[PDB]
């Protein structure tokens, strides 16, 4: 029948695939899959066998995500599926020429590969993405942060885990899927069944990181045959949309990657107007350093509506939010003997929004506060921080008297938006507050005058406020009017 | 046309050898791939081996490893085959097909029956 | 490697009436799956290629369903020249080629 890996699946669009050679004249793939005279490898049917069974994952006949894509093979692995980043940059500038040569169209690059960080390979995978490529790599197969692996670490690409059939991490021996705040999204890659290069109607059964990048690039090339105009910011954002959330136990991931690793499953839904997509973006650590400062910045096309920031200790100053490049940034603020905190940033798309920061300094009387006057401005997030080492209506933001608050007022006569909140007197761990159904978080932050509030953040449309007066999680909901 | 004309039936005598030959016309002979099925009368299909009339590449079941060779000759257009120490087993009724590359058998032979008695 | 299980071995119906013959793959092989048909002193001639399509010279009472696993071959209305032996096939690596083990039409009265 129906092989697992397609259960949650239902025009001048090209699919880039750097990989080892492939076996085009496999009945899977023949016909639709183009072999170039790229080829750059550190030096028959072993040569062929991952690159055939990647091509089959995107556009297999019987097998494949996008059924009959029309795919472009460039050889940057080997015969024992190994490469270098030089030869990989040549294959990558190969693509730039070819994109100035042939006729204009949606462009998808399909990099399952990794090596460790390399400034130059995410350089130009940041080069591609600004000509309106839409790039798609394997997170790694590692047990690692992918955030220490390239092209997974580039911020302009699409960045995929693996899962298996009962929609769990990958586990191969000692090792498996990578995880992180750089990982965008999981996709099925175990078991996979593809093109087996042994033969022209053979199939083989292959595992990883480069076939869960192979799906997502199926999809990616579904969504650009329907709408050719997609950018790369409304592409991701439909990916994690459409994606099956909390399906995956956490329990796999280390303790600490748990609130980084995004909860997503890649699938793509029944088709069935212009609604409000919000994701959450994660700072890197900031460092022991008590003036250390942890930085979360949207990516470009996206709008930062709101900031929060979290310390597993606890001791932090806050977070604020500030004007940067013509747009707003999140900032955290380490506190004195600190181990560091994380800026976490909910990133959304809301065009022409041009937010602006309101900030109120600390009254220091019975609190602070803060709101949005402009007309057509909605207020989406609260931000607050404090210089002292330890401290003692609606359409508002409120502080603590000693700190200074901040208001995120985005220009959006469409949204319509409210707070929600919800108070636990004596918390076990976390405080939790949803948006309700049809409604989209766009700030999440704690009511000040509480006694030990370790952070906030954002997971899909719940306000998770963690905790060591009744400690309170606000949710700002916004939707659109329709 | 495509026709594919066997050749060589008969009695062997055990422990010894056939020689079967299988003519083709009507289409380019390097272009497919050639196999040599037998089967046994009231039993199925079994394989012997296959030959790529391009690169002379060949295949063999492992039942019949050190026994069967098959060769070809592409100025007469002829497929061959050998089987060598034959045991009254080997009574069965040869084939030669033709098979379009990762299509299917378009094209066989008549039959040929080789009789394997002292 | 790959077997192709043939259900059931001997087919007994009468002329006019439905036929249905299942092969089942041991592993997913997609849908490309061969039927031969093979009449007695008659070498086996291809009926259904890729599981579904009428080979050159197939009348349309033959038709064929599946994909992965699961294969079926189905005569609409039996023809007294349809009481033959089907043969399932397809492609693997180390045998490089996989036949059924045959079901046999046999006419009922």
């Known amino acids: 029948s129906i092989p697992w890996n397609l259960e949650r699946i239902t025009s001048l669009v090209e699919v880039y695939l750097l990989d080892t050679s492939i076996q085009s004249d496999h009945r899977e793939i023949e016909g639709r899959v183009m072999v170039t005279d790229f080829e750059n490898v550190p030096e028959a049917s072993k040569c062929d066998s991952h690159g055939t069974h990647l091509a089959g994952v995107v556009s297999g006949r019987d097998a494949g995500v996008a059924k009959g894509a029309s795919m472009r093979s460039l050889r940057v692995l080997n015969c024992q599926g190994k490469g270098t980043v030089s030869g990989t940059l040549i294959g990558l500038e190969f693509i730039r020429k070819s994109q100035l040569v042939q006729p204009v169209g949606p462009l998808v690059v399909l990099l399952p590969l990794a090596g460790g960080y390399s400034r130059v390979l995410n350089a130009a995978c940041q080069r591609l993405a600004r000509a309106g490529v839409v790039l798609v790599t394997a997170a790694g197969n590692f047990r690692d942060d992918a955030c220490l692996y390239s092209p997974a670490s580039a911020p302009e690409v699409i960045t995929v885990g693996a899962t298996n059939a009962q929609d769990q991490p990958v586990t191969l021996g000692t090792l498996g899927t990578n995880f992180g705040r750089c990982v965008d999204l999981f996709a099925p890659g175990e078991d996979i069944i593809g093109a087996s290069s042994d033969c022209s109607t053979c199939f083989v059964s292959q595992s990883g990181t480069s076939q869960a990048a192979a799906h997502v690039a199926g999809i990616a090339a579904m969504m650009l045959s329907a709408e050719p105009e997609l950018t790369l910011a409304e592409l991701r954002q439909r990916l994690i949309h459409f994606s099956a959330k909390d399906v995956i136990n956490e329990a796999w991931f280390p303790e600490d990657q748990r609130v980084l690793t995004p909860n997503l499953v890649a699938a793509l839904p029944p088709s069935t107007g212009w609604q409000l997509f919000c994701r959450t973006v994660w700072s890197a650590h900031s460092g022991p350093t008590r003036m250390a400062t942890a930085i979360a910045r949207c990516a470009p096309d996206e709008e930062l509506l709101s900031c929060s920031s979290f310390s597993r200790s606890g001791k932090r100053r806050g977070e604020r939010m500030e004007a940067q490049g013509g747009k707003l940034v999140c900032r955290a603020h380490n506190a004195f003997g600190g181990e560091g905190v994380y800026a976490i940033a909910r990133c959304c798309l809301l065009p022409q929004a041009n937010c602006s920061v309101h900030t109120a300094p600390p009254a220091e009387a019975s609190g602070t506060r803060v709101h949005c006057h402009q007309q057509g401005h909605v207020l989406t997030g609260c931000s607050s921080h404090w210089e002292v080492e330890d401290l003692g209506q609606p359409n508002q933001c409120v502080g603590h008297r000693e700190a200074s608050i901040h208001a995120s007022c985005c220009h959006a006569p469409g949204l319509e938006c409210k707070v929600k909140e919800h108070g636990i007197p004596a918390p076990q761990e976390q405080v939790t507050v949803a948006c309700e159904e049809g409604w989209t978080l766009t700030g999440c932050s704690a009511l000040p005058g509480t006694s030990h509030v370790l952070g906030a953040y954002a997971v899909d449309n719940t306000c998770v406020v963690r905790s060591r007066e009744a400690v309170t999680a606000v949710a700002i909901c916004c939707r659109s009017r329709h | 046309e495509v026709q594919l004309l066997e050749s060589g039936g008969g009695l062997v005598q055990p422990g010894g050898s056939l020689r079967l030959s299988c003519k083709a016309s009507?289409?380019?002979?390097?272009?497919?791939?050639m196999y040599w099925v037998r089967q046994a009368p009231g039993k199925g299909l079994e394989w012997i081996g296959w030959?790529?009339?391009?690169?002379?590449?060949?295949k063999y079941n492992e039942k019949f490893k050190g026994k069967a060779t098959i060769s070809r000759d592409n100025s007469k257009n002829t497929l061959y085959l050998q089987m060598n120490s034959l045991r009254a087993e080997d009574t069965a009724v040869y084939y030669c097909?033709?098979?379009?590359?990762?299509?299917?058998?378009?094209?066989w032979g008549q039959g040929t029956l080789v009789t394997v008695s002292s | 490697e790959i077997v192709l299980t043939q259900s059931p071995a001997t087919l007994s119906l009468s002329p006019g009436e439905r036929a249905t013959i299942t092969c089942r793959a041991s592993?997913?092989?997609?849908?490309?799956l061969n039927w031969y048909q093979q009449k007695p002193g008659q070498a086996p001639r291809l009926l259904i290629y890729?599981?579904?399509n009428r080979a050159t010279g197939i009348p349309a009472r033959f038709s064929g369903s599946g994909s992965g696993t699961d294969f079926t071959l189905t005569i609409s209305s039996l023809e007294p020249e349809d009481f033959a032996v089907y043969y399932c096939?397809?492609?693997?690596?180390?045998?490089?080629?996989?036949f059924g083990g045959g079901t046999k039409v046999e006419i009922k009265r």
């Open positions: 009507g289409y380019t002979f390097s272009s497919y791939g």
């Open positions: 592993q997913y092989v997609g849908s490309y």
């Open positions: 096939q397809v492609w693997d690596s180390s045998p490089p080629v996989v």
């Open positions: 097909a033709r098979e379009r590359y990762g299509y299917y058998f378009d094209y």
């Open positions: 890729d599981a579904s």
């Open positions: 030959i790529d009339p391009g690169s002379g590449g060949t």
